[PDB]
Amino acid sequence: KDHTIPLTLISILADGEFHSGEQLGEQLGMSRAAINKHIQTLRDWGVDVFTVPGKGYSLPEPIHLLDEKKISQEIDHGRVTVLPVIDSTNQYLLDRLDELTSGDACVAEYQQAGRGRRGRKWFSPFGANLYLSMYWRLEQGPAAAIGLSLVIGIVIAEVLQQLGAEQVRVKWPNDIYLQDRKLSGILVELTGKTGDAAQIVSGAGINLVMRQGWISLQEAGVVIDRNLLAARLIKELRLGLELFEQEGLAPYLPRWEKLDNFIHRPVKLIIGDKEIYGISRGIDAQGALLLEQDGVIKAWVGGEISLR
Amino acid sequence: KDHTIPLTLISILADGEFHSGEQLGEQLGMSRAAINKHIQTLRDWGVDVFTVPGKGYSLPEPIHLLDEKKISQEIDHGRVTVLPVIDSTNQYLLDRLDELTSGDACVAEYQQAGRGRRGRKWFSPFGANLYLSMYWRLEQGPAAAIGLSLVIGIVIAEVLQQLGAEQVRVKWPNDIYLQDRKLSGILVELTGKTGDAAQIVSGAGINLVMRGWISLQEAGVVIDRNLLAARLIKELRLGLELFEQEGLAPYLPRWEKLDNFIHRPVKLIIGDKEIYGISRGIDAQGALLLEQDGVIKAWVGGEISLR
């Protein structure tokens, strides 16, 4: 049944402040007697309404109304948007940083300008692979994005493992590997201030279809509906990040050890155009890379790990 | 830029079947030459399209497109609907049983015809208390709804405990209590077949404001209604799915900590009958264990009251 007028009426009084029959009549476009009549319906609904005689109405105390969007977000800790065509899922969230909350996600079917790490281009054919991005605000500094990327790699690799691909491994600071071949590229981008929060948009591109250095989930004997895989990743990533927010990197230290593709192996550390050679010894308790050169282990807080 | 036509083209070709430029022109309302040109736009997007003379265009293999509702459904296992005015949240779900999946929920601000267990009426004033309902299909029989109700009671009391009401207790088979006063009424209704599944719509009305009954306001506990509803729906979905795969075993110790009437003189009411004894909790299948004259017997029905 149409209850539009009483429902609009209660939303104007939900603040608990004083509301005059004249102002109500202006907003609702109704007479003062009819405004009173629709106040009368509300009291028949069990709403306590105070009637100041001749001046207007007020609620005893402010009331907060039910909202689908508010309820869903607390259920979800984030929204999801599907884009058929976009330049990049990372760029879509980056363009809307002022309006995002931690957990907001974004999946695309086709990326017109998918981006890699070093200015590389991510080939994103329509409806073939997964092109996902999610936003997260870290109250810790921009240096917390290292743990961000490490947690993301652990979560993504774990989710793939529960779906069949038991030999999926991670790469410091962000990539997913399988049989020493790149299966998914992660691109974590950040704008922040030291001593303050950091807004992070992380984007994952997972090779699902085959089309020497690259591998696909099809080549692993794993076939998944993209909607199911995307939903599982968004759900698990959201849970992993809030755990990282409240407990830090400590829960993920044993998990990184089980998943590191390059631990105790000869690797290449890439910073700028430099190339540092050594044996990887995992990560430290703060997510810094532990790289052994000539028997000496030094901690690195930046760069990329490569194969040798 | 407008990408409607290439996107409509790919949704028409996503089946993997053959589609002739004539058929495409009919659906797309476009010429045959322009259809061919926009086929090329799809190929510039990395879509494999075969141009077979005399048969049509086709994708090499059927492709499955991304859907927001499908993705959201797996993230949530259930949707949520807020209704400003409705007769009953239980009735809303019951009217739509053919379209519901386990976890679908329903919150109302005002219920015109609130419903109790034995046909009494739940007074549901607008924007005062929580009027929530959820659907669930149990693959086990209708007798599994007793464990359903027990899990629902445990979850709701647990959620309330984490929000401040640390002394909230449960009642067999379904009610929420506080200081031996009714704090929330649960109405679990079901339709099923023995030896088959049962569709269950459970509805909880939680007294939040003061107007034998107790409210969360009277306990010094204030919760945002949006926050309480969201937490309940999440925990109920998680709790019910755990019950689906592990049974009542995880909840047996949890029920004991929350039973308001265990080891107390109680009244078992079935119909107009009154059976007297001391409650000794529940069994592993959710049946009430009632001690009368030193003998503990399991009951599969009725309501527990106080004496």
Ligand SMILES: O=C(O)CCCC[C@@H]1SC[C@@H]2NC(=O)N[C@@H]21
């Ligand atoms: O290997 C790399 O350098 C990172 C590649 C990241 C690719 C994904 S596709 C989803 C998201 N959107 C982008 O533009 N990039 C990432």
Ligand SMILES: O=C(O)CCCC[C@@H]1SC[C@@H]2NC(=O)N[C@@H]21
């Ligand atoms: O104590 C009882 O007999 C059960 C009361 C159940 C009340 C709730 S309010 C939400 C849902 N909608 C209804 O009509 N009833 C339940």
